[PDB]
Amino acid sequence: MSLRIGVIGTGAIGKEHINRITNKLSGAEIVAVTDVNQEAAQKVVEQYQLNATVYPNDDSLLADENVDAVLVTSWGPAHESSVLKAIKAQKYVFCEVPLATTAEGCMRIVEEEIKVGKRLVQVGFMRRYDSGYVQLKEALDNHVIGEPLMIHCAHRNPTVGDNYTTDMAVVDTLVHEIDVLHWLVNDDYESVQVIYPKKSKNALPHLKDPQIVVIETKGGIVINAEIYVNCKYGYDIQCEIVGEDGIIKLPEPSSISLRKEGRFSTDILMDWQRRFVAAYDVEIQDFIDSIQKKGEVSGPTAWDGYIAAVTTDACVKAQESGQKEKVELKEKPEFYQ
Amino acid sequence: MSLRIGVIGTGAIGKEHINRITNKLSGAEIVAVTDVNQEAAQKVVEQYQLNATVYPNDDSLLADENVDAVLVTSWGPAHESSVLKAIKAQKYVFCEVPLATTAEGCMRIVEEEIKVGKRLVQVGFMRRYDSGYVQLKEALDNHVIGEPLMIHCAHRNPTVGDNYTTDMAVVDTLVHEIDVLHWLVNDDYESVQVIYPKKSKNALPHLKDPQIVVIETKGGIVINAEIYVNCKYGYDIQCEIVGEDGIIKLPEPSSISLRKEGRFSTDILMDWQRRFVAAYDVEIQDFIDSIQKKGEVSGPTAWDGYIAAVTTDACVKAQESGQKEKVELKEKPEFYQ
Amino acid sequence: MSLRIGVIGTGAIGKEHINRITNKLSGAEIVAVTDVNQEAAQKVVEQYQLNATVYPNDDSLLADENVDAVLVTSWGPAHESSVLKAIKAQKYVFCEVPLATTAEGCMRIVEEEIKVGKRLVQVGFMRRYDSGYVQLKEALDNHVIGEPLMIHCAHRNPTVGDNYTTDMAVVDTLVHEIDVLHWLVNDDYESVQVIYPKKSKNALPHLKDPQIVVIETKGGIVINAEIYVNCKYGYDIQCEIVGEDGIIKLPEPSSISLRKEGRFSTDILMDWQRRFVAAYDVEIQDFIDSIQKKGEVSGPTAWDGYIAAVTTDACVKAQESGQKEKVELKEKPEFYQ
Amino acid sequence: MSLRIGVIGTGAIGKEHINRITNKLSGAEIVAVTDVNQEAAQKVVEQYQLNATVYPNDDSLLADENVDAVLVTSWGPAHESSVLKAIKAQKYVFCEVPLATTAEGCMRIVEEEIKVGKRLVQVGFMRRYDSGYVQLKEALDNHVIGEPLMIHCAHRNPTVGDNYTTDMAVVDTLVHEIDVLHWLVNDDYESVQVIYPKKSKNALPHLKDPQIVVIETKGGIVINAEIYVNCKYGYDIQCEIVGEDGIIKLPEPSSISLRKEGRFSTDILMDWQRRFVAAYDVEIQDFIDSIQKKGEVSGPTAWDGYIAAVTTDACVKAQESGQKEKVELKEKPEFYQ
């Protein structure tokens, strides 16, 4: 008896989730899609031979009682709207980042879920299902390196478009680190501070690139985090955690080594999409399985999406100030531990 | 409209395929299982909450017209029997290695499939779906290193049981290399030759371990291949292909690096099962998808299973002779290219 | 016709230079040693079978006209005294770090050398002769990665003594990075800023360990630099330079890899002395050779020692202030380019 | 009081030893050189500003009582002549490989040294002084991986000249492995067997390239050894030793890693000379030091040179026969352990 899923937002990553659920995972199907370009969410239904109803809007989709779960995977701001609706409609919502564009918007969503008595919100912070990050998590839980003291990490991308702006670096990009990092160390962030190095020749004039970002936590962990999205050479994610008695570090994507013309190479990816393909799969599948065999969602909480929003805000605030901004977090509700 | 699958042989790897098809892949279900220990193939139906009929034997299972595909995943010799039946019953057969224990048994199976006009036989040589081996394949197809000249490889295992015998090394074990190697280089084997090094202290008395194995091909490619199944340190697969202008080499399983107490370590697996978990998944899924969207199977042919059998035989013949045995292969039928 | 060398300061590193010059390098000998513990200098002359005169003090040694070059390898704050003397005595001075303990003390030494018309001062910043750092230098000079934008680096040590204090971290330790880094990028430092993470359990109570240190340059290069001297696992130097179009990174000390008990290890050094043994050798030898075939010294200038002093000061100033200190450098004298 | 050294054979490697002893090592000088092109030896004495006598022949040089040690660095088949002379002249001989071109020629040289009562012969098998091979040696001596069972290794070179012939592969080239390998495992060779793979496009027509070479020892260790001297990509030495409980493997030459245009490279050498530069240095220096402080030579014995000769012969015998040749070794003289 499979899980009936409605996708709100048949975009490019909305299309990747539809294709994975259709042709790759187990125990779910797409029965309902709405888009704001109604013709596109009608191109998608034909393209993946779906048996789905095309709604003009989220409301008429959440209306349908066929659907017990929605993928929210449209624009960055048109999320908070759709999520809040689906919480009251008593459906299961998987929400792609961001949870909502504003810190309070996340808070309004937390409050709703608290009422509704059980977890229906999973935030699409896929890094927690990547095997690399799980091994890291594993070791830290086992105290392998003892108490964590520093973290060094990088999020690098070959080039970006004309539509890519100085804040997107802390909003669209550094956001995943922001999630995965505190997940790992089990601490709350206590201050951000941006620092701009020399501007890159590959960066457009309207964009500040690269940029370091330093983050203290309550415990005393210090994290410097490089974001450079015009690095030209590849898409590359790096994370090294120094602890009291040792160091653990994230792996490279598996590659065949080559020996040719003087050099001993491995391979570096160019397409951000390709880097996490398998964590997407594991992540959705866990949404499904966690529902059919538990009656609630499992992954990153709606609260975790709030911490992202607060800290993303702290960042963009230090981006234009050059100062050491703060991260104030409202008390963690009992509903969450 | 899903694919209805009958598993003949609810063993330990029969159980892994059932669990993957049930809870991990898309577009198939298990409706029919038979085992020779009828109570075990009744423990399995309860354990994975299946909706399946428990048959006393293959015949009564192939009888059922619910099932259009069988997993043959029981004993090593009780394969040739079940496969040949399912070819005449006009079902789709996925067969775990070996195809059949004897070289002619593979030949009897080829002849049957040739009649039946289309490919219904996929042999479970999973290495072709491991991302490592695909990258290797990719590079060779692109002539990256030019013409292949030598191959060095190893199949190593921590320890083995009392039931593990000197021939199983070339039959159960070196068999995958034997498949994947000629797949890659696109050549037929022309001679084997075993060579025994000093016996290991970890090997039991009744077993010869390690052993090198040298294989020429028609083209002139030379392959030495180490098999050491009491290596004690881990399960480890290595393959390096030297060519005219360069060298390509298989990767290590992804690992987090650690720095602690003098050493800079990564991690090595202990459980042969864990090494290929993802190629199993991709492999089954491709059986399914290749059927529902093509009306035939895709992967390794029944012919490829024959080449395994001939060459496995050539080996065990050189195992007890100490001589340079030959590999004679009947002409490749037009039905196959 | 060999080079006649006087060692002022027959300490433990004074002794290593004496042993290398005696039994390892070419074209020089020790003919004169003074120490402040006069008995230790006589026991040294006997230990390495030298043909040398034991002076009571630097002055009587610089007096001797046998000697045309001195190694100053005495207790730290003793350097400025001895160097200034040897500049007026018109000898060649090789000075171990620091050049002098105070920024102006370096300035007094610069002014003296400017008068004396030729370079007689080489500062013992050996990192410039390590093959790793030379390869880095090479690449940057060839614009391989284009314009440098960031640098990440680490200086880690297993444990330290009771005599090791919170400033020694920026004075004895981070000092080599401070030299080698601006050498590489060809830029002057423009600001330091210390940041203290959680204190380590391996650090004594009187010591702040670890600590990050952030350094901007004039050009815009940003450098974070970790110093952790109770890291427990080994002695380890790391330096990664990110540029506009690529990344270059320093190597590990050569090691044999091992496969044993689950892990795939290389080796990490424990003794800070062992890490640079071969740069010391190359460095002294270049002092010698550069003299006998040029009539002046070659390596790091007395000026470069001044930049270390200014910047070392900037650091210890930001160490106790928690603020973003500045690095003001007097104009580079024409005598130096 | 330095060591007075006569070089017989002022060739290209004769010249490298002269330059190292003159300008790089400690406690020795060149006072006497002879060459068969007498004009080349006079031009050498001028080039390196030596204080040396130019003899017309070895005899008149060994005549001189100034010299107490000779480097024999002359054309290959010229060695046996000069060495035997210098043994009777009672001088110290450092002999570059080969010791002598024929197996009995080595035997004649062993017999002479046995009479003369002390070791004056050091064979120039430098691999024993390379830090890699020393680490390997170290581990094996400590039983890290337990009992050695197999060895895989490779000697690869970019391209060779027109003067490079199918036997030089086992004579000039595989000879160093032949020495270093039995040194390491502490065993005598018991059989060789050549095997030719597909001929390379980079190899000239008159040369068979690559070639495998399989060597059993008495103990049961099996060694396959690849020689490919037109591999085109670099000069590359690889050696992996598999043992009962683990695997140890030789390192790569230290390199800076680069990230650029899709790839994560290190560097591979092109010039065979550059690979061992530091083992040459350590090797000569140990000749010197071992003499001045022991009154005999230390390194590889004249016996070890004989084992190379026997085994080199065994190989070239299996090179043209395609058969499994044998290695018969006369009893090891008590003079040698």
Ligand SMILES: NC(=O)c1ccc[n+]([C@@H]2O[C@H](COP(=O)([O-])OP(=O)(O)OC[C@H]3O[C@@H](n4cnc5c(N)ncnc54)[C@H](O)[C@@H]3O)[C@@H](O)[C@H]2O)c1
């Ligand atoms: N977690 C990750 O690593 C990751 C990766 C990529 C994208 N994303 C996120 O996914 C979301 C979409 O990403 P994209 O790059 O595919 O964007 P996209 O432009 O392809 O998708 C937006 C689509 O949604 C539609 N739309 C907007 N508002 C809607 C609404 N209220 N109801 C129905 N349809 C609506 C638009 O017509 C458009 O087709 C973004 O929030 C982005 O941040 C996350």
Ligand SMILES: NC(=O)c1ccc[n+]([C@@H]2O[C@H](COP(=O)([O-])OP(=O)(O)OC[C@H]3O[C@@H](n4cnc5c(N)ncnc54)[C@H](O)[C@@H]3O)[C@@H](O)[C@H]2O)c1
């Ligand atoms: N491709 C691979 O890497 C790989 C890995 C593991 C196992 N295998 C293969 O899978 C097969 C089974 O492996 P296993 O280790 O799980 O063995 P197993 O002992 O667990 O499975 C055998 C089972 O089949 C049953 N059986 C025997 N003949 C039967 C028949 N004719 N009809 C129905 N049931 C029958 C037995 O009762 C038993 O339960 C073997 O051929 C083995 O070589 C392949």
Ligand SMILES: NC(=O)c1ccc[n+]([C@@H]2O[C@H](COP(=O)([O-])OP(=O)(O)OC[C@H]3O[C@@H](n4cnc5c(N)ncnc54)[C@H](O)[C@@H]3O)[C@@H](O)[C@H]2O)c1
């Ligand atoms: N650059 C490097 O790689 C490096 C490495 C290690 C040490 N050092 C530095 O080198 C210097 C010496 O180090 P060390 O470990 O040998 O010190 P040490 O304490 O072991 O020895 C110093 C010796 O010099 C003598 N001495 C002090 N002042 C003197 C003077 N004015 N005249 C004559 N003798 C005097 C002392 O009696 C003592 O015997 C220090 O500044 C140290 O920090 C540099």
Ligand SMILES: NC(=O)c1ccc[n+]([C@@H]2O[C@H](COP(=O)([O-])OP(=O)(O)OC[C@H]3O[C@@H](n4cnc5c(N)ncnc54)[C@H](O)[C@@H]3O)[C@@H](O)[C@H]2O)c1
């Ligand atoms: N072990 C190693 O790492 C290593 C490395 C390179 C070369 N080698 C070997 O060293 C030897 C010399 O190599 P090379 O490259 O210098 O050779 P080369 O051809 O460049 O020079 C040989 C020189 O010695 C002279 N000579 C020959 N016979 C003589 C004799 N009887 N008396 C005096 N002079 C004589 C020649 O005139 C010539 O000038 C060869 O056997 C070579 O294979 C060993």
Ligand SMILES: O[C@H]1[C@H](O)[C@@H](O)[C@H](O)[C@@H](O)[C@H]1O
């Ligand atoms: O949202 C994505 C992604 O998270 C990366 O930060 C960046 O490489 C992409 O260009 C961006 O659009």
Ligand SMILES: O[C@H]1[C@H](O)[C@@H](O)[C@H](O)[C@@H](O)[C@H]1O
């Ligand atoms: O069939 C398996 C496998 O293919 C391996 O060769 C070996 O490690 C196992 O023990 C064997 O039983």
Ligand SMILES: O[C@H]1[C@H](O)[C@@H](O)[C@H](O)[C@@H](O)[C@H]1O
């Ligand atoms: O450069 C070194 C290094 O920092 C060591 O950690 C310290 O013990 C030494 O005193 C110093 O000279």
Ligand SMILES: O[C@H]1[C@H](O)[C@@H](O)[C@H](O)[C@@H](O)[C@H]1O
């Ligand atoms: O040891 C070397 C090596 O094998 C080179 O490939 C060869 O050119 C030299 O002649 C030989 O001495």
